[PDB]
Structures are given as structure tokens and as C-alpha cells.
């Protein structure tokens, strides 16, 4: 079989579902970086992908992703009881009270940033979100962040996710940003352990710095650093979803009115933004033993990818997935496998994103501010979603003019 890495990279979000569509199947065999790969889509496929008796993550992450997006030694690369113990550390951070606290900090940082946006006249909304997110998440996590360093640190965190998948010198910047962010986070962990940094007992950096593994040993400082960055970086990546919130408000008739007057609408709206827009790329695992499924062979060791975007657009589940319709979530049964913008299955027993509560809370803050507080003009621009970009974004980055918050 031919290597299809280039075709995938040219259409990273839609390649799998388009090929599935052509074959009339929810799975097909392909090859990426010269490695045979079964590509899966849909709720039934997601349920098998999350069966940890059939799939493992250890050794499955391509080195280039380790050197940019994720780091090395983090929870994403663990299996079994080692994984579940590490995953508990992240899950303990996500209490309703703590999630609310981060959302409040973010609202405050967004409001603090507005005067600067007004003074600029014209802004690229996406570009402006990374710093307020960085400031909020650092404060929340007990990470000191001097005012004069916040801009630079926000740029480094952005590079980890925004420049990692760029086929350009930007990827090299992502690699340098990873080296810098790991070293910075390690100094934070070291300071906490030495008692020179006074992070609170409820904060992420404290929890991670003092986490004991299954042998009652502290994480090595590098691993602790990577895990701390696994809180900081993806919180900054919410800039992408906030940009999509602004995009939906701009391009979908009736949405703004519904959000303004119907209090229960915001929850439905944020979920539909997660369903509708591409963001999370396909997740990778490896078959842990020989099995067969739906007439497809999964030999032990076979690389397997789960298409999140395609699953979120599966007509069997949604009927009319092509339409942006928040109302559809009134009929959702909260199934753990059929709606998977940040993974499927169970949070404790699998690799599902622990950041979902934070993402939902911050997206609701964004939707609230964009319809009830923040006034802005939207000049003529290319708002179409760039499906060739990782992460995907409106081509313009969502340009605003005349931004103020006295409305």
C-alpha cells in the first residue's frame, strides 16, 4: 500500500472521513510515515479505541509531537495502573469550585485587556487571546508570572500548539519554545519543592510538584514540568475555541439573539461549537493484541487513529451534522462515545481530556462577553475555516475593529 502522509497533512481533519465516505465504511487501512495504520471513525469505533484491553498508548506518540506539542514523559504516553494513577492527579484539579475560579480569573484578564484592544483600533482576535489566558491560568495554577514576562510566555505556550503542525521554520520555533517552557516549568517545580515558591495547596503547580507516583516517589522535575505544561498549554489553546465562538456568532443567523435572551442556550451553543468546528486532530494508539473488528484485521502492534472530527460529523449519530444547530443538544443523551471533540470514554479509566470542564466554562465566559459586554465591528475579511491549518482557524484570525466594553 502507498504512503498517504502527504494527503493526510493536506487535509488533516477531513482526510479520514472523506475516505470512509468513498468506501462506505467506518474504517480503512492506510499508511503514514511508512507505518501501516487503521483509520477509525464513528461511535462504535470510538468504543473499541477506548477499550484498554485492546489498545495501548505507550510508544505510540511520534517523536516530533513529543518535541513540540506534548513534551516527553507526560500522562498521554502512559498505560494501565501507571496511567490511571497519573490521570487522577489531573482529575483532582477539576472541582466545580476550582473550575469557576479559573473562569473568573479569565473574565478579569479579558476585561483588563480590552483598553489595549481599543487603543490598537484594529485587532486580530485570535492573536489577542493567548496572553489573557496565560495570565489567568498561571495565576490559577500557582505559577508566578511577572507582568513584563506574560507576553513572552504566552507566545511560547502558543507556539507549542499553534506552530507544532506548521510545515515551516515555525516548527523550529515550536521546538525551541518547548525547550524553554520545559526549563521554565522545571524551575517552578524546583522552587516549590525548595520552598522558595509559595503556591497554594489547592493549585495545579502544588499538586503536580508534590504528586507521589505508585512507589511513593516524587515525579522527576522534568516530568513534573511537562505535566504542569499539560495544564498551562491546553488552557491557552482555548484561544482557538474562543475564536470559533466569535466565528459562529458572525456567520450563523439567529445565534446572537438566541444567546442574548435564552439563558439555557449558552450551554447548548458551546457544545455545538465543540461538535461543529475542527480542532482536535485524530488520536493515535497501538493494538495491544490480535483481534478482528467489523471485518478488519487489527494485528498486535498495528497503529490505529481515531478521527474525532469525522465522528462529530457522523450523520448516523447527528442526522444533519453539516448544520450549526445548538438546539440539537437538547436531544443528546450524554453518550461517552458519540460526541468526542476532546476524546471519548471515561476520564479516569482512559485518556479522555480532563480539561473539558475548563474548556466549557471559559467558552461560556467568552460567549457571555461577546454578546453582553464587548462591542466590536467586523470588517470585510476571509472568515472561512482553514482546514489545511493545524489547528484550524478562520483564515483572517477573526479581525475586529472599534473594540470597547461600554456596551
CB neighbour list of residue 6: distance below 8 Å, 6 or more residues apart: none
Residue 161 interacting partner from ligand PLM, ligand HEM, none (CB closer than 5 to 8 Å by kind): ligand PLM
Write each residue from 192 to 221 as x if it is in contact with ligand PLM (CB under 6 A), else as -, in one continuous string. ------------------------------
Half-sphere exposure of 265 (CA within 13 A, CB side): 14
73 binds ligand PLM (CB under 6 A): no
Residues contributing to the site for ligand HEM (CB under 6 A):
75-76, 87, 90, 230-231, 234-235, 237-238, 241, 279-280, 283, 308, 342-343, 351-355, 358-359
Residue 13 interacting partner from ligand HEM, ligand PLM, none (CB closer than 5 to 8 Å by kind): none
Distance CA 215, CA 202 (A): 23
Instruction: Supply the DSSP string of 101-123, one letter for each residue.
Output: HHHHHHHHHHHHHHHHHHHHSEE
Strand pairing of 399-404 and 296-298? Answer: unpaired
Write each residue from 135 to 174 as x if it is in contact with ligand PLM (CB under 6 A), else as -, in one continuous string. --------------------------x--xx-x-------
280 binds ligand PLM (CB under 6 A): yes
Residue 235 interacting partner from ligand PLM, ligand HEM, none (CB closer than 5 to 8 Å by kind): ligand HEM
Residues after which a C–N gap over 2.5 Å breaks the chain: none
Smallest gap from Cβ 81 to ligand HEM, in A, equals: 13
390 binds ligand PLM (CB under 6 A): yes
Nearer to ligand PLM, 237 or 363 (CB): 237
C-alpha dihedral (297, 303, 309, 312), degrees to nearest 10: 40
229 binds ligand PLM (CB under 6 A): no
Query: For residues 141 and 203, is the Cβ–Cβ distance under 8 A?
Result: yes
Q: By rule CB under 6 A, what count of residues binds ligand PLM?
A: 15
Smallest gap from Cβ 123 to ligand HEM, in A, equals: 21
**173 grid coordinates:** 520555533
Smallest gap from Cβ 39 to ligand PLM, in A, equals: 17
Angle at the Cα of 69 from the Cα atoms of 141 and 111, rounded to 5 degrees: 45
Residue with cell 458551546: 270
Q: Cα 239 vs. chain centroid, distance in angstroms? A: 10
**2 grid coordinates:** 502507498
Spatial CA neighbour of 345 closest among 25, 44, 62: 44
Nearer to ligand PLM, 309 or 376 (CB): 309
C-alpha dihedral (268, 364, 137, 401), degrees to nearest 10: 120
Radius of gyration (Cα) for the chain, nearest Å? 21
Nearer to ligand PLM, 106 or 298 (CB): 106
Smallest gap from Cβ 341 to ligand PLM, in A, equals: 10
Nearer to ligand PLM, 114 or 143 (CB): 143
Binding site for ligand PLM (CB under 6 A): 64-65, 69, 161, 164-165, 167, 233-234, 237, 279-281, 390-391
Amino acid at each position: 500500500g502507498p504512503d498517504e502522509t502527504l494527503s493526510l497533512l493536506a487535509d488533516p481533519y477531513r482526510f479520514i472521513s472523506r475516505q470512509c465516505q468513498r468506501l462506505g465504511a467506518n474504517a480503512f487501512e492506510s499508511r503514514f510515515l511508512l507505518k501501516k495504520t487503521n483509520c477509525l471513525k464513528g461511535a462504535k469505533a470510538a468504543e473499541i479505541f477506548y477499550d484498554t484491553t485492546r489498545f495501548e498508548r505507550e510508544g505510540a506518540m511520534p517523536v516530533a509531537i513529543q518535541k513540540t506539542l506534548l513534551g516527553q514523559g507526560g500522562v498521554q504516553g502512559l498505560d494501565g495502573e501507571t496511567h490511571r494513577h497519573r490521570k487522577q492527579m489531573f482529575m483532582g484539579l477539576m472541582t466545580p469550585e476550582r473550575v469557576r475560579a479559573l473562569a473568573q480569573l479569565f473574565e478579569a484578564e479579558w476585561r483588563r485587556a480590552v483598553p489595549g484592544w481599543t487603543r490598537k483600533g484594529e485587532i486580530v482576535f485570535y492573536d489577542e487571546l493567548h496572553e489573557p489566558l496565560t495570565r489567568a491560568v498561571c495565576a490559577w495554577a500557582g505559577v508566578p508570572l511577572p507582568d513584563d514576562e506574560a507576553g513572552n510566555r504566552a507566545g511560547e505556550l502558543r507556539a507549542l500548539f499553534d506552530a507544532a503542525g506548521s510545515a515551516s521554520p515555525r516548527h523550529l520555533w515550536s521546538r525551541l519554545a518547548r525547550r524553554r517552557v520545559d526549563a521554565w516549568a522545571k524551575r517552578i517545580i524546583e522552587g516549590i519543592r525548595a520552598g522558595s515558591i509559595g503556591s497554594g495547596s489547592g493549585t495545579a503547580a502544588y499538586a503536580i510538584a508534590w504528586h507521589r507516583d505508585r512507589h511513593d516517589d516524587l515525579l522527576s522535575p522534568h516530568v513534573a514540568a511537562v505535566e504542569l505544561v499539560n495544564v498551562l498549554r491546553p488552557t491557552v489553546a482555548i484561544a482557538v475555541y474562543i475564536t470559533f465562538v466569535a466565528h459562529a456568532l458572525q456567520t450563523c443567523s439567529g445565534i446572537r439573539a438566541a444567546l442574548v435572551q435564552q439563558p439555557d442556550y449558552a450551554e447548548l451553543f458551546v457544545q455545538e461549537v465543540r461538535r461543529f468546528y475542527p480542532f482536535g486532530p485524530a488520536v493515535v494508539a497501538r493494538a495491544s493484541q490480535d483481534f478482528e473488528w467489523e471485518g478488519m484485521a487489527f494485528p498486535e502492534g498495528r497503529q490505529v487513529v481515531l478521527d474525532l472530527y469525522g465522528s462529530n460529523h457522523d450523520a448516523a449519530t447527528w442526522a444533519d451534522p453539516q448544520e450549526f444547530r445548538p438546539e440539537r443538544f437538547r436531544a443528546w443523551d450524554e453518550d461517552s462515545f458519540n460526541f468526542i471533540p476532546q476524546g471519548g470514554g471515561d476520564h479516569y479509566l482512559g485518556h479522555r481530556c480532563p480539561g473539558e470542564w475548563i474548556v466549557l466554562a471559559i467558552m461560556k465566559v467568552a460567549a457571555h462577553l461577546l454578546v453582553n459586554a464587548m462591542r466590536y465591528d467586523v470588517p470585510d475579511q476571509d472568515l472561512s475555516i482553514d482546514f489545511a491549518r493545524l489547528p484550524a482557524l478562520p483564515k483572517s484570525g477573526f479581525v475586529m475593529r472599534n473594540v470597547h466594553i461600554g456596551g
